[PDB]
Design a protein around this ligand. Structure first.
Ligand SMILES: NCc1ccc(C(=O)N[C@H]2Cc3cccc(C(=O)O)c3O[B-]2(O)O)cc1
Ligand SMILES: [Zn+2]
Ligand SMILES: [Zn+2]
Ligand SMILES: [Zn+2]
Length: 231
């Protein structure tokens, strides 16, 4: 029942309710002639919503906000971007213009600037060392160490045992490396181990791209990254 890449035209956004007050958002984007799905998260915080990640571009993110207003009808007041690439910050200007306060770690803000990408306004403190965690409204933000990118964060929703891994976690159908130009292959398995150690109770694990599963997605990702290391 989870929407798949073949079911979502580029420019449209789907919402998937995971638990009371917890949804993923799913969009698609063209990249080198192929179409990829991408996931983010929406978490209810009282009568407001917290958004995790844009929907990969300004047009998709505008559609995301329209879809949230239509289907949920509560204001998105804050958003967190889990790393500096365009599937996570692309659309931050649309969010900002809509009154959403945008956040990212200082590491992400710096890398986005260097890269010429959109830059979340607010800096999240307390995430600069591997293994650091902070509570941000209804979620916990965790810096596991460098993996898909040096700045990547993961997000946990304690009320629903939902772990959103972002692009540091691969879906099961992905059996070879994705986009790894900015990755730290040497540290990626260690960073995943920090995730497993901190969130052993996670029930629903969401990759940056594709289908959710359980905690098996962590060991899956390690296997793929190690095989790519040994290419
Ligand atoms: N300057 C080189 C460069 C250009 C684009 C991207 C980029 O936007 N990458 C995103 C889109 C994408 C495209 C294909 C696979 C993935 C993935 O997460 O593996 C994926 O997620 B990224 O965050 O790395 C990264 C580096
Ligand atoms: Zn990335
Ligand atoms: Zn502000
Ligand atoms: Zn990605």
């Amino acid at each position: 029942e989870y929407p798949t890449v073949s079911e979502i035209p580029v420019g449209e956004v789907r919402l998937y309710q995971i638990a009371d007050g917890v949804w993923s958002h799913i969009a698609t984007q063209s990249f080198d002639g192929a179409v990829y799905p991408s996931n983010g998260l929406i978490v209810r915080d009282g009568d407001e919503l917290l958004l995790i990640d844009t929907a990969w571009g300004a047009k998709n993110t505008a559609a995301l906000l329209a879809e949230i207003e239509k289907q949920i009808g509560l204001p998105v007041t804050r958003a967190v971007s889990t790393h500096f690439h365009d599937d996570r910050v692309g659309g931050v200007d649309v969010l900002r213009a809509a009154g959403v306060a945008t956040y990212a770690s200082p590491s992400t803000r710096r890398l986005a600037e260097v890269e010429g990408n959109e830059i979340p306004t607010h800096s999240l403190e307390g995430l600069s060392s591997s293994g650091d965690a902070v509570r941000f409204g209804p979620v916990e933000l965790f810096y596991p160490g460098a993996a898909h990118s040096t700045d990547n964060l993961v997000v946990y929703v304690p009320s629903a045992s939902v772990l959103y891994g972002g692009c540091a976690i691969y879906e099961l159908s992905r059996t070879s490396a994705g986009n790894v130009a900015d990755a730290d292959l040497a540290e990626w398995p260690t960073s995943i181990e920090r995730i497993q150690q901190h969130y052993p109770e996670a029930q629903f694990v969401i990759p940056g791209h594709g289908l959710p599963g359980g905690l098996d997605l962590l060991k899956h990702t390690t296997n793929v990254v190690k095989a790519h290391t040994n290419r």
